[PDB]
Design a protein around this ligand. Sequence first.
Ligand code: AMP
Ligand code: MOO
Ligand code: MOO
Ligand code: CL
Ligand code: CL
Ligand code: MG
Ligand code: MG
Ligand code: MG
Ligand code: MG
Ligand code: MG
Ligand code: MG
Ligand code: NA
Lengths: 358, 358
Amino acid sequence: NPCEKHSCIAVIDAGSTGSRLHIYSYDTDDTNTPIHIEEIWNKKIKPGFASIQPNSVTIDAYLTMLLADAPIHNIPVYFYATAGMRLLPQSQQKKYYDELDYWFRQQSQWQLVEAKTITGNDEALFDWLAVNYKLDTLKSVQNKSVGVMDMGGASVQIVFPMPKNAEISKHNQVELNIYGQNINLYVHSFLGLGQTEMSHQFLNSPSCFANDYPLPDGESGQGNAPSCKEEVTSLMNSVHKVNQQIQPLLALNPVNEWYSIGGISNLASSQLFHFENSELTNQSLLQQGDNQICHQQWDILNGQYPDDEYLYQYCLLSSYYYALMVDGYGINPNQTIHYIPPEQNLDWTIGVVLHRAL
Amino acid sequence: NPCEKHSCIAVIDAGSTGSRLHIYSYDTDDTNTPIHIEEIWNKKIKPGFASIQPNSVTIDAYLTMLLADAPIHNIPVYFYATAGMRLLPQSQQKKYYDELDYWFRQQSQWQLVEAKTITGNDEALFDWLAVNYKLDTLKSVQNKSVGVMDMGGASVQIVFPMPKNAEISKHNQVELNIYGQNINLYVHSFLGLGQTEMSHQFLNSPSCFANDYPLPDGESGQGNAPSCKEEVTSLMNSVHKVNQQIQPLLALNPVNEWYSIGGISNLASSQLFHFENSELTNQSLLQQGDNQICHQQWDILNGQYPDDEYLYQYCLLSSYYYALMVDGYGINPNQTIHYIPPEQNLDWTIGVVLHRAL
Ligand SMILES: Nc1ncnc2c1ncn2[C@@H]1O[C@H](COP(=O)(O)O)[C@@H](O)[C@H]1O
Ligand code: MOO
Ligand code: MOO
Ligand SMILES: [Cl-]
Ligand SMILES: [Cl-]
Ligand SMILES: [Mg+2]
Ligand SMILES: [Mg+2]
Ligand SMILES: [Mg+2]
Ligand SMILES: [Mg+2]
Ligand SMILES: [Mg+2]
Ligand SMILES: [Mg+2]
Ligand code: NA
C-alpha cells in the first residue's frame, strides 16, 4: 500500500461518455508541490454521469461501480465533471450533486473534498498541466512552445503559452508558478464541438459517410472527406468563429510541438488508420479517412471490420478533426500532431493533482 | 369500456425527451378507414427511450412504467421512435429493439405490430395527418393549403401540400388517398435542429441568455434576441441549408394556414408571453422574448416564474424559433402560426392510426 508512505488522492474525470477514477500517489518538493506522481489505480465506467437519472438508487449503483473495488480507499476524492454536465442547466446539475453529496456522507471509505462541474477553461488548464507533466517539460524554462488539444465528446479544448494580455478576456488566460517557473497560458474550450455533439449536425450529410451507408433520413452515403470537411468547417467558423478567435493568437504565439489527447488517440490507433510514432498529420488523417472509409462501399467495409463500433463515423471524424485543427485553429496540414497512446488512459486529472498546490 | 364497443390501438411516440403512450378507440368507414378517433388513455414517461441503457433490466423497468397500468392491453401496439433514436447508429439501435422485442414476447395481451425508428419524412407525414385529422380537413377537397411544423427536441419537421415534383427526391414527397381524396405532400425533417441538439451549440453565447445568467464557461448572459437569432441562423443556413431547401418550394406552393406542434406550444403558453387564440407571430415572439427575458435579470426572472422549468432557455428559444421559421423556412414574421393548446397533447400518433389503414 503506497498510500501508507506517500500522499494519495483520487480524481474522477466525469466526462460526457463515462467516468474515469484515478488514484495517484506522490511526494512533494519543499514548496509542497507534487512530484513523483504515479497512477496506482485506474477504472473507467459507462455511461457519462450526466446521462443517468439523478435519483438515490441510480447514483448509488453508479458510484458503487466506479469506486467499490479500488484497492485503496480512505483517501481524499475530487469529482470533477466536464462538458456532459455543462450541457445541463445548473438547476438540473444541482440534483446530481445533492444526491452525490448524500452518497458520500452516507459512507466512510472515501473523503469527498469537492464534487463540481469545472469550466472548459479549467479543464484546458488541467489538460496542459497533465500532458506537460507527462512529457517532463514543467521542470525548467523551455526552448519550445508546447500546445495541447483535448478532443472530447461534447467539448474540445486548446491551450498554449501566451504572454499575459490585457486585450483578451481574463477567463481565457491563466498564469501559474510551478517548480519556480512562471507560465502564462491561453485557454479555450468550445462547447458543442466535441465529437458526439458535432456529429448530431451531420448525420444526414452523404459526404460524411461511406458509399451506401443508410443515413437516418433514408438517403445514401456518398463519402468524400474534403466535402464533409467543408461542411464541418461551417459549424467551426460560421457558427463558433473558431478561426477568428484562435488563429490570430497562434500566429503571434507559435506552438512548436502539438500534443493531443481525447478521442483522436482512439481513432488514430484503430485498425482502419495507420500512423507511426504515435503521431499524425492532418493531411494524412484526411487522406486516410477519404480513401479507407469515405470512398468504400459501406456493407462491404462493415463486414470486413466487424470489431470496431466507431467504423461508421470514421469518414466524418477524420473530416471533423481536419476542419477543427486546420480550418479552425489554423494548424498547417503537414504539421506533426503527437497523440498520447490510448493505453495510457491519459486525461487532465494529473493537472488536478498539481494545481491545488500552486 | 370503449374497446368492448370500438376498435382500439396503442401508439407510442418514443421521442427524444420521453415516450408517450396513447390508446385510441375508433370506428371505420366503408373502406375500413378509421373515423371517430378518440383518445382513451395517455401516459408520458421520461427520459427518452434512446437515453436509457439497452439491457433487459432497464428496458423491462421502462416498458413496465410506460405500459403496465394501461386500462386495456389486448390490442395492437405500434412503438415508433423518432429523432432521439435516429442520433444512434443502426448497430446501437438494434440492441434496444432486440430487448424490447424480447419484453413483448413475455406479454400475453399486448400485440406488438411494429417497433422501429421511423424516418423524419414519415414523422412529418404523420404530423400533417394528425393535425389535419383534428382540423377536420381530410374529408373534403380544401380551399386553402394547411402547412404543419413539429418542433421536437432533436429534429424539426415541416410538411405542406405540393403536387408531385419529379425533380425533388421521392423521399421528400408522399402521395396518399384518404377518404376518397388524393393528397400530395412535401415532407422534410432536419436532424440536429430540434431544440435540445441546437441549444448545445449556443450555451456559451451571452446574447442567448438573460442578463447575468451564469454560462457554463463562467461568463454572464447579456441577452439580445436579434443577436442570438443571427447566431442560430448560421446553424440553420450556413450549416443545414434550410432556406435553400425550403423557401423555393414554399414560394411556389404557398401555405395559407400554419399549425405548429411540439415544443413551441409550451414556450408560447408561458405567462411571459401575450398571445391570444392559441396563435402567435414570429415578430411578436422575438420582440416579447427580447424584452421580457433576454434583457431582464436572471435572478429576478428565476424567482418570478417558479413554474417555468425551462425559463433559462426562453431567450434562446424565442430567437431559435424565429431563426427557423423566418430565416430558414422564409415564413413572413407577421404571419399567424397556430399552435395546439399544450393540454391537448397533440403529437403525430393519430397519423399512424390513419396511415396503417391506407
Ligand atoms: N475508435 C474511436 N474513434 C474515435 N473516437 C473514439 C473511438 N473510441 C472511443 N472514442 C471516443 O473517445 C472518447 C473517450 O472514449 P472512452 O474512453 O470510451 O470514454 C469518447 O468521445 C469516445 O466517443
Ligand atoms: O465531457 Mo468531454 O467528453 O471531455 O467533452
Ligand atoms: O424525437 Mo423528437 O423530440 O420529436 O426530435
Ligand atoms: Cl431523418
Ligand atoms: Cl465551458
Ligand atoms: Mg474529457
Ligand atoms: Mg445528447
Ligand atoms: Mg456548409
Ligand atoms: Mg377490444
Ligand atoms: Mg416529437
Ligand atoms: Mg454566426
Ligand atoms: Na447536440
